[PDB]
């Protein structure tokens, strides 16, 4: 279900940011996506260890 | 950035590690007459790549 999730980005879809918004906000949108979805898959990790 | 510039003629990547100069010459190459040596691309099929 986290995949579903804006985390403060303009959408949670990988294509569809990139190809409307220039280069530099996409890479801030993409990275703030990429840390939150990284952050769910720890601690992810540490409830099933 | 996205625009006339930096979209056709000179596209900067995202990561670049340095800076530009800018400074103001109206007297070396700009002429009364209009200096039409300087020109700029405005139509490309495509984008640019870095």
């Given at each position: 279900?986290?995949?579903?999730?804006?985390?403060?980005?303009?959408?949670?879809?990988?294509?569809?940011?990139?190809?409307?918004?220039?280069?530099?906000?996409?890479?801030?949108?993409?990275?703030?996506?990429?840390?939150?979805?990284?952050?769910?898959?720890?601690?992810?990790?540490?409830?099933?260890? | 950035?996205?625009?006339?510039?930096?979209?056709?003629?000179?596209?900067?990547?995202?990561?670049?590690?340095?800076?530009?100069?800018?400074?103001?010459?109206?007297?070396?190459?700009?002429?009364?007459?209009?200096?039409?040596?300087?020109?700029?691309?405005?139509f490309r099929k495509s984008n640019?790549?870095?």
């Open positions: 279900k986290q995949l579903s999730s804006k985390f403060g980005a303009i959408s949670s879809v990988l294509n569809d940011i990139l190809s409307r918004l220039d280069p530099p906000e996409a890479e801030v949108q993409i990275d703030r996506l990429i840390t939150g979805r990284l952050q769910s898959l720890q601690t992810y990790v540490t409830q099933q260890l | 950035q996205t625009g006339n510039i930096a979209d056709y003629n000179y596209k900067l990547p995202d990561d670049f590690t340095g800076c530009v100069i800018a400074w103001n010459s109206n007297k070396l190459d700009s002429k009364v007459g209009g200096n039409y040596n300087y020109l700029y691309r405005l640019l790549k870095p």
